[PDB]
Symmetry: none
Subunit: 100 residues, 3 copies
């Protein structure tokens, strides 16, 4: 058999093998391993698989996906300046004299 | 024909095939599909392709690439053992109001 | 010999070749290239390889990996007082009950 070795194939003791380079590996953890190992991507920090085996970015605190699957990002306000003093109650600035 | 099955190839009946696992798939969306499908990476949220067919991180609102291809982006009351309230953008001792 | 052409293989002048599409390429920069090229992923902005060839996200200013490999936001003003129906005043960086002081 002729193989095109410039297109990712090579011989390993006369058997055609995928010659897997950067970002790829053979999955030695399937039910059929180590005799039958599928090729898979090789991934590290910040990448995962979803349920379909698709690569996704691994998002932590502060980050989310928008509506197109793009990565996106995602202290109390000032009381009124009317000369009057304010205290804090149930998430609101409430006039001091309310309690005096 | 001899294939090395522990290196990503398998027989699909009599025919030699790539055995694609996680992060990989066959592209059924070409002109030539379904009879000739290239192997491609399998991608989801957070990843996209370039025009050059390269995988890139898919960035939305608030994130961008820096110039070397990496992803990038009331004051406290006085501390003096006394109680304080908010008035005109200042922190003003409570006592002052009693 | 027969190949499953719907499974990522094709003929190039009789020779069996991987038919590489989006996110893959052959590496022409090896010690046996260009007559022998491995298949590799094809990566651009936001991605790199680690030392062992695994793809990682490339992080710049203000972003960091946490200890579980996830991308996160890297790293005074007052917080909310208690939401318990009571009034509060600020003393020594703590919300203390206005009650105390009357």
């Amino acid at each position: 058999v002729s193989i095109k070795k410039s297109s990712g194939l090579n011989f390993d003791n006369t058997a055609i093998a995928i010659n897997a380079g950067k970002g790829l590996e053979f999955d030695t953890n399937t039910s059929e391993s180590p005799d039958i190992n599928p090729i898979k991507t090789k991934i590290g920090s910040g990448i995962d698989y979803n349920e379909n085996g698709a690569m996704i970015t691994k998002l932590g605190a502060g980050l989310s996906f928008d509506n197109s699957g793009a990565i996106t990002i995602g202290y109390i306000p000032e009381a009124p300046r009317d000369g009057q003093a304010y205290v804090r109650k149930d998430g609101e600035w409430v006039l001091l004299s309310t309690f005096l």
